[PDB]
Design a protein around this nucleic acid. Structure first.
Lengths: 46, 26, 271, 93
RNA sequence: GAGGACCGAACCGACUAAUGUUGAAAAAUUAGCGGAUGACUUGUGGCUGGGGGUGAAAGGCCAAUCAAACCGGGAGAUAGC
RNA sequence: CGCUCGCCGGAAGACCAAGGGUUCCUGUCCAACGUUAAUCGGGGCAGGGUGAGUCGACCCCUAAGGCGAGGCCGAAAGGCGUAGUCGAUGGGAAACAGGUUAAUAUUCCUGUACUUGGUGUUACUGCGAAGGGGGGACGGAGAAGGCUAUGUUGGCCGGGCGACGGUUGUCCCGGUUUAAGCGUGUAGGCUGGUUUUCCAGGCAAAUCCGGAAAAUCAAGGCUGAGGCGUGAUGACGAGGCACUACGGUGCUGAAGCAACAAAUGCCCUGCUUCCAGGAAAAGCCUCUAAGCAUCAGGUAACAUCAAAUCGUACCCCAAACCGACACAGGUGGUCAGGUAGAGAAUACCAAGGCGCUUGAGAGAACUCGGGUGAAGGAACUAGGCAAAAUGGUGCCGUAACUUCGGGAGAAGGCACGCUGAUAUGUAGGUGAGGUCCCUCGCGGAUGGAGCUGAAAUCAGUCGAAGAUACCAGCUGGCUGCAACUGUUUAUUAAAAACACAGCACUGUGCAAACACGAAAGUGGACGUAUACGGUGUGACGCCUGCCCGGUGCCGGAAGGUUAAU
């Protein structure tokens, strides 16, 4: 029926985007943990 | 193309959460 | 007057409307308006801090002059207007120098009446004077508690206070709840009583009539679970507990005033 | 008015398509692959200075890079900008 | 010409029955069914964050997860079984 | 590819937004992928394809809300918030029609426009803001009138003359299109107009707004569909004709009118009416202050240039989106033809799109999904579950009870087709030329051809049946509960539960009680006791008994006990 994932890029980039992650202390720790892991894509952005 | 570049494991388990009728007491 | 509706429906049967043909049939005075967006009972943390608020009709805030600082300038009431933000009606007045203001509507007030604020006015409904010049026993409304601040007492639809005694720099007022409260005599007050005194006679009739005022439904604490309200659950309709708030503080009689800063101005609490 | 060494870097390659040659024969329009940051004024300044002809209107578009699968991986070609330079009446190149 | 008016499509729901039950579908189809100018319905943004929210109140819902979500950690908890 | 056949047509068609990201088009391959085969494909491979001053984004403006210099708070992290700055789902600026590609078009090309901004002259020149005032600028419902899209028929034009009886008529088939823009300014709607004087207003100061009188005219201004002219002797155009692989491209191209019926679209953000009393800011117009001097700007016409940059293919009720799938599901907006019909229901069709990616047989049980039944009619069964039945419109008729509204479509009847007359088409609707007058032009009055057209009654007729299909109420009686509409356990419970209007008690004097928050603060509320919060009860009607020992709450504080100190 109506499933849980209804995509919108604007709601994506405002929730999980790079500037949303770089706004707070706990999102810069997310981005620190994803550079320390070696992740290809850092955020949802591109 | 007789090269065989196959695929992999490509999602996890949906539900084993299944039917439950049958008792002997309540 | 009040008028019972003919029961052509359920939800129309018990309705009693309070119609006033003296009210303006048109859009209100535009310079004195303001955007008034709803809250939901939600504070700046975004949490519900007052339950049963939300929805309702869009409202525009009318800027009402409670201070009445145009002293000595005669005004004339252009029209009485409905106000969705309060219980009273409001009166678009127009001072002699061409300024339109909104005041609360007194009881004997119609379009074409005169009002005048200032200490050298006459004693008639709509006139605002500081209470050194208002005689004792006069019914007054829109009473300031601090001199020059704005009216706070006696502002709902059919309300008034009585200046029941006066000596020194303090009058004492019998408020509408029955409280005898001292107020320093330099405070202003409008004569008369507030005008929409038939407001307590209307019946909403139906559940959605409360819903288009912004009153969401009240869930009864006994109909909840023990996790939600101290009025618990129970196999059936059980109570067995002293009645409390949702936060466990006892209702049905426990007094909650604790203000030692202002109790020197209360000379008798309500009965 | 654009600096001369900037104009020498915008016109990458003349584009051959059989749509591009229809435009050259029927509407006097040369179709050029240009640099990615080329503006319609920089193309107009470069076709006039370097091809020694006259230009009415440059129309541009940006062609998206196709995703191709060379071998076993997933590559992506580069986006490129494509001009539609409409010369007025005299055609040299 | 009013109405949480009436009948009835879109729409929103989900009363009954049959099918389906390794399904076409991790809740649907088919035939009927209730509301359908309203306490309606819907789009697009927003806001409330886990002993917390939100709840016309069912322990409901909070990403197919809810009498305390998920992820990572304490952590190789402990386990007279 | 062709000829049939079936299916959808308020969608299974056409088109946007989202989302996807090349799935688009062409040539190639057929391993795997495709629930079969495949020469085919949304598969592989290689090319090609997306063209903007006007569409969208960007941009200017703000809403919710975010962030937030200083600031206030807070072990720290940080929370809050002022200025301010972001944020559309809203407000601000301008293009249409034909033609075109294998694939792009309001973008290319022809034709005709239009917008904004930068830049070169005239007279009379006061221009000038983080300011002032307008305006922008706003609800629900309802009712028309004026239209139009569109349709329908007639006329015109082109063609036909019938594979089986008839068919040179009052026959048949097809077409009868044309926009922005510019011009005029009427059906409507709104509004008294104009000068002159004065002032405690709009923090200033204002020749604007507001106010106050006063002279003179209500004959003035805004607004606004649609017409009609122009755009346009142009384009398009049925069809013939060299073209020529007859696909197709190519040259031609006749008519291109009128009447009637028409929206859910426009006038209309109007009008009327209601109470629940219905964004904001800019663009815009206008007023000036500091400022400023035949400077700088403004204003008009004319001339020049500039309008960047991104998006633009394709899918969108889907095999490209969300559902692990080429998944019977979900998915915002727009367009919406004919014949019946009240209708976007439904039936059959058009434009258009498809036949759902395994078939061929056979015609056992049994199982799904339907059809029909003698006689009986609920005997079935937990239970009329399921099925059958009822079903439309008009008219007659309709009970107890009732809160006087209802109950009520109660119940129950009857009339329905087709043809003819009444009347070669009526009642109405529309309305021509004609007549006549003026403020003589988009008029007014009469006029009443043409066109359209129910409904009814008589008579006749046909069938077993005339709401013939689809479509489309089973009804009544007595009771429990809940006043009611509503809400609820997404995914076994829709209820008697919840909510409710009402009712009562209680708190609450405003820096309100409460709530969120170590706090600041913020909700309550820009409210103020006719208000708010909490609790219980649950429309209405009649009512609300007795108990203050227990337990709370409230009030009292003489005594007894009692902390830190």
């Amino acid at each position: 029926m109506k499933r849980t994932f209804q995509p919108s890029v604007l709601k994506r980039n405002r929730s999980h985007g790079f500037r949303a992650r770089m706004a707070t202390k706990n999102g810069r720790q997310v981005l620190a943990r994803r550079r320390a892991k070696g992740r290809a894509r850092l955020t949802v952005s591109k | 193309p007789n090269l065989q570049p196959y695929f992999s494991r490509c999602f996890s388990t949906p539900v084993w959460i299944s039917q439950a009728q049958g008792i002997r007491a309540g | 007057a009040v008028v019972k509706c003919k029961p052509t429906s359920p939800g129309r049967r018990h309705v009693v409307k309070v119609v006033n043909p003296e009210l303006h049939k048109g859009k209100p005075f535009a310079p004195l308006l303001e955007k008034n967006s709803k809250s939901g009972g939600r504070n700046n943390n975004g949490r519900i801090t007052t339950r049963h608020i939300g929805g309702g009709h869009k409202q525009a805030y009318r800027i009402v002059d409670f201070k009445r600082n145009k002293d000595g300038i005669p005004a004339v009431v252009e029209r009485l207007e409905y106000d969705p933000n309060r219980s009273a009606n409001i009166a678009l007045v127009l001072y002699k120098d061409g300024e339109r203001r909104y005041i609360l509507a007194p009881k004997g007030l119609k379009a074409g009446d005169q009002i005048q604020s200032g200490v050298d006015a006459a004693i008639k409904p709509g006139n605002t004077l500081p209470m050194r010049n208002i005689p004792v026993g006069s019914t007054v409304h829109n009473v300031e508690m601090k001199p020059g601040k704005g009216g706070q007492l006696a502002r709902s639809a059919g309300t008034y206070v009585q200046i029941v005694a006066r000596d020194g720099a303090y009058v004492t007022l019998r408020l509408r709840s029955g409280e005898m409260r001292k107020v320093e005599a330099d405070c202003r007050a409008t004569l008369g009583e507030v005008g929409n005194a038939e407001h307590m006679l209307r019946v909403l009739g139906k559940a959605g009539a409360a819903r288009w005022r912004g009153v969401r439904p009240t869930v009864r604490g006994t109909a909840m679970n023990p996790v939600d309200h101290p009025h618990g659950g129970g196999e059936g309709r059980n109570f067995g507990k002293h009645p409390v708030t949702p936060w466990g503080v006892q209702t049905k009689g426990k007094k909650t005033r604790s203000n030692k800063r202002t109790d020197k101005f209360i000379v008798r609490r309500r009965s | 008015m654009i600096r001369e060494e900037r104009l020498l870097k915008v016109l990458r390659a003349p584009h051959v398509s059989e749509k591009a040659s229809t435009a050259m024969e029927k509407s006097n329009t040369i179709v050029l692959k240009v640099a990615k940051d080329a503006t319609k004024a920089e193309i107009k300044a470069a076709v006039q200075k370097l091809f020694e002809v006259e230009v009415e209107v440059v129309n541009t578009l940006v062609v998206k890079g196709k995703v191709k699968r060379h071998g076993q991986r997933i590559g992506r070609r580069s986006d490129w900008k494509k001009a539609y330079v409409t010369l007025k009446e005299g055609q040299n190149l």
